[PDB]
RNA sequence: ACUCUGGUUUCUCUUCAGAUCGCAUAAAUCUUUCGCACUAAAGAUUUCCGUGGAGAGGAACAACUCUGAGU
């Protein structure tokens, strides 16, 4: 890290059918913390990446936008949001109701 | 020199010959006054001896300077690329008397006023590598004992000439190890048709009186 | 012939809703800063490596550090060091932080942020001040009404009858910011193979906490994409001769229609 | 001693070419001529309190802003701006006394060396040889002859006609401060005005460099018109009438060959052109010894070499799918014929240089024995004498370019290196293998 | 003329005739923050003016971005002025000398160049992002430049479709934007008449992405065309503000009736726009024809089958027609060149307006002496020749005329900077295809061709053989100061002359660019920021000097500064011991340095005004303030020379005989500096005493100036000095969810986040900080990388701060590749500067002193 | 895999998203086709 | 509001296309490049994968909704 950062600063100043690409050929080993642990693309608390599980993606949210939404929304807006969340939970339960074995 | 050969584009340093053997910290450093003074000295030396009889070319020669901007004075005499570094500029660096280093003390005070770091010149290493390659290639039908004797003679000459500098030049040590490995591989091929999986050094390094090849090698071949 | 695919706005909205799982749900392309095709090309051409991107063999052989010897403009003892210039800071400003940046494609500066408050509940009206938007603080030499500024009885706003919101209004305003196939409303039916459904995932930055194998796979996919992009020689002008249509014109070929399974079995038997 | 006004005229710090003012004590050149300007600051700081404006040509005390008046300083102005009088530009043949430079070295104008900045040997030799011709030297020694040339404003080739004039004027300065002139400005202009060709870094072919320089001077002397009657075109370009023909076919019978011989498919035509340089091709070395010729260098007489261009001597060209058997004839001879013997060729796997010597008498010669019969008596003067020879000694890859020039005024044919001026015996001039030769028709 | 031009609505002969008129030319610059929409707005203007040039559906037709660097980098690089004839709201056709300046904070030099060749500024504010750092900076600079201002609001489509605020909230955001703009204006304005409001007719509401430019008057005229018999001016006077409309009385009531009547503007302007944008972008297929018929626009089947965004642009262009409102607002606010001639002459023209030549220039008469002025010097396509660009303040420059191009320092006493040239073949100011012309009447913008030989940065072309009592237009005063330095050398030293010629050309090209060669032989070139220098290199190595050049690591131009008072009295003597001066150094009172640097305390004023402004504001003694000598290094310099000689010992006349030499020496010393060969700021050097000989041969001349410089250096070194570094204010605009990451990024660069705040109406916050420029290299890349490309930042040198350590500290070691710690910065900075500059590595307090 | 197999669906054989591999192999086959066709045509001559 | 050349679909052929001909992406040969080239880059070439432009011909069903035009 720190010694690696100093060494990197100094450096800047001065057959066999391999099936799976070995991890040696990978990138993104950055000494600096700012370019290693960067804030993800939180789409204003209303979007996320593609492909990943929507429930998992929403569960692992940063909750920063949620706090502002719950501390800024109006009481009538809060009631409407609660009704919408109840409807979504009922839809999920209906999906959960169709699952049996 | 500027009057008799002006270079307003500061192109004098475009051709100054530095030693690629020594690291960038110890080399001439190619300064402004340094490069110009070196070129001036080379010209003044060349302008003295007439070119009709014999001329010292400015390319194959080497002018190295030591000054406020160049702390190390590098020389290459008798095939031994040296680099004298005075203690006045080598301060905050304790003296660890390795084999490669040659502490050049004073005359009257008898104190170490400098340290003449030494290393085998790249020309000598190239000559040794060429000799080893020729010996391996021109082995042919000669007995393994003859090839071993030739390799031993070459190694003895190389080690006895560059007695100390053979250690500092890590490239020279790597070349010696590679040459020994090549000679051992040639001997093994001459003995075994296939590739012998770790043939014992007793076959190679045993003295001639005991019947071995009598190889004298400077490798780290642990018994 | 299936050459034009122009659907209505609600149809495209329903298609985007049914396919939003595979879409990256981005707004501004600025989120891929120093990670675009131009950035990858500049990194490859400069013999550098973007940490989130691939790396290839240098385009031009680079001499060693010792090839230069403490030049007056290369003396380490004169450069003031505050932060180490990483490969990103060089691939971003190639002309200022890279000596001899031969064939270094520049990258576009930050486009303005797409501040689009995406909808979350259909019940809410179309043009409503969402809580996400920061509130506007409500704190004009208006002439007095004592004058005779009277408008004719027929003067009315142009869209007095037209409402300020609609059922498809919010959805329509949503499709403005969308992946390209959703953004457009009239397109040409491309080939099945020519529609990569996973390219946008690889193009984006790798997901956080992925294993080394996944990161290496993403880097290799980015390398393949950059190789296919840098070698994008435009196609040549052919005479437009159809081999299939030519064989159809040949009297030694018949035409019929059969299931893909039966045709595949027949092709396997023919190959055997 | 430190004043060298050969390089570019720019400021020390300002790096601007406007309102420059060189320092007569500090050596370097600054900008401005008053307070708050770089010149005043440089004079105050370095105590160098004497500056001359490179454009106003006046010596002024920059710290005090008081122009000085001393005629004893006219040497500096003369060295900076060499101007040749109306009569002094014609007394070049009356060069009796040796011109001693301000340094400790006697010399003669015209016999001066151009510093070999990297591999500038070819260009330096070509320039020092072209400057020998009194026509071109006189034309370039009068700035009025080219200042009013109507060149396009957005053209860079006009620098070649302007920079070469400065070099020619400096090389003929009777009271130059130094004993040599640096071709840095002229060579840099040539490099810029040639599209990365014939640069100062890598040496080039002397014949190619001479041809390119002559073409650039001919296209730059004319201005805003197709005025072919340029100074270079009038002083070193002549007329040759190539009565050339072609052969029908090598693989055809008598009937098919005669058909093309009679159907104008193998006809002889006159394609008379302007031969600025006559590439007299030397014969390849026999590559075999003989009883005679104790020296193994195959000699060759100039008359036999130059007889190829005569009407009788036919030459064959191996054009694509044709046997172009031609024959040349010199219609009109230029006042200063320039001959460049192509002593270097390309082999099937390399590029060899023919070492055959050209036994060329350097006293008197006449081309009337090879001229065209139509106007043989039209050319009253034909007794041409060689004026300058440029020999490229050494191996083709690593080779030196030396110039053996016959100086006027005196009779000594001095041989000049890049920066060394020696004396060459006239018999020894015909010994070194010449590459480019320029002869005066007298 | 036998020229060739693209087809246009107007006529080239008509354009020339309009140019011949002196009171119908609009000299405007479209100043605006980064990516506000200025270039696209000019593109819309061109598309209306040039029927052939049309915008592609996806890629906007950037007809104002000619340079390749601006073409690909995205951000505007330089100002591409356009002079085109466009109609107005009433119907009269004007011509507009527009100049589309870039918005980048680093590229503020082009904006400064544009204002000196224009009479008014059209500020551009993005509706979604409101005022930004560049917008505020441009407003301050323009108002300080004493030019008319007309703020316009663009990117309303962002509010109407992206942000989706309700029309009342949209009006609230617009009103807040206008109030903020007016408040910023009043902070620096002088005359209360400089107010901006849609009611005042100095505001335009546009959307460059869809050509939705309009104003109160123009949109009321749209009603008039739709309805008829409506007083557009009086009605538009009631169309904006808090007043509500009452349909029952058919009148607009100041007090809002019915308890549900929105504002007049929202009711009439916002509502329809909303309705039409919602129909086009959300319900096109269903209710597109009915809405089009109601609005009156007819579109063919092909035109209504476009994509949503191009179809919206087409519908808006049909609905609003031409950009009449913008032209009407510009004519109303931005005066004619004859009207604005006197302010320009008083402000930028030197020699005084009341002068005879000043009066002639103020008359703005084409049949007068030629006293033109060229601000920017543009480069030809080939990159060989340069085409100076300026507007004729008087006379009529014509092709083939002989001119006397007075340089940037062609003073009256010393005309040595003059260069009599022959201008010829000048074109008109078109953007992408210039149009030639024979003459140039007084008021139009002329792109001369041939006067570029002496035109380094700025020049004023005059008339030779006449106007012998003339002055040179005052040199440009830029908004911010360049602090970054970058040494450059060719990879192959053979091509050094080519590189230096290219460097001279690029110095001429960029106005604020500073180039020099130091005693160490480095080719240092200055620059405002980072992208600025990146563009400089991308032009130097690929356009002017096609060779490859090696650029060193960027640095920050440090400045000297004294902390404590003078340690002792320094007695410096001139050579031959004829004179013995003595100066005592003392740091300047806080605020006085920034007051002098802002030209507030102008030494150009008389003794009374300067004495009053020093005794009152600075609280200086009424006798001490009456003995000022000079203004340090420059005319507006952070150093003050005070004649503190006691009259009992020093004769006033004898000191005056050396006063000029002393002032020149003090200026040279403050320009040079004793510590790191850098400008000395925030000091007050006072001559405690002096000995002066009688004869000018022995006293003064070439001896006082070096003694003065030595005394100044000794005084500035004896007092405990301290190096200073530039601190660049950074205004990062990031989403509130990412402001924490913005604070985290600025933590690792020795910079504090001065203020965080959300944008009114926008979810993205606007964090403001002040990161020192020395460690700010690459900060933008880190900020936009640690936030996954969701934050952008700019920079501008706000002020200077003292280095944390001490420069004259010999007890601190350094490292070749290890960043020195916080306390070891000043000594390291001084040593590395003296090494890079090649000066002596040691500067002791007894270096230039008399005794050593 | 690493994208789909997240949440309730862990590691297993049920991943049926094969368009990418299908596209890659279709491109490889389209590239390979001319060489194999030329070889087969050369084989069956006269 | 009167009238008017003007229908689309689909099949085939020729010719042109450096426009992201295609919001996709392969193959082969030579050349230069360090090896000692799936695991490698560069330059070129060629064939496929299949397009757009225009023209020409053909058979299905629209005949003026439409729009441009002749008011
Ligand atoms: O190496 P990983 O990417 O973690 O994946 C390995 C393995 O790969 P290796 O052959 O390199 O060990 C296979 O995955 P692939 O990389 O080959 O696709 C395997 O799955 P398959 O045999 O079905 O391909 C399984 O991967 P997964 O866990 O995704 O099924 C396994 O993973 P672990 O090594 O983590 O057990």
Numbering used by the authors:
A (entry chain G): 242 to 255, 270 to 356
B (entry chain A): 1113 to 1335
C (entry chain A): 224 to 362, 369 to 501
D (entry chain U): 114 to 201, 203 to 556
E (entry chain C): 105 to 956
F (entry chain A): 613 to 658
Sentences from the paper on this structure:
Here cryo-electron microscopy analyses of human CE pre-B complex and B-like complexes reveal extensive structural similarities with their CI counterparts. The results indicate that the CE and CI spliceosome assembly pathways converge already at the pre-B stage. Add-back experiments using purified CE pre-B complexes, coupled with cryo-electron microscopy, elucidate the order of the extensive remodelling events that accompany the formation of B complexes and B-like complexes. The molecular triggers and roles of B-specific proteins in these rearrangements are also identified.
The spatial organization of the tri-snRNP proteins in pre-BAMPPNP complexes was the same as in the CE pre-B protomers. In contrast to pre-B complexes, in which the RecA domains of PRP28 are in an inactive, open conformation, in pre-BAMPPNP they exhibit a closed conformation. Consistent with the absence of additional structural rearrangements in tri-snRNP components, the 5′ss of the adjacent protomer is not base paired to the U6 ACAGA box. Indeed, the release and transfer of the 5′ss to the U6 ACAGA box would require ATP hydrolysis and lead to the release of the RecA domains of PRP28 from U1 snRNP and PRP8, as observed in the pre-BATP complex.
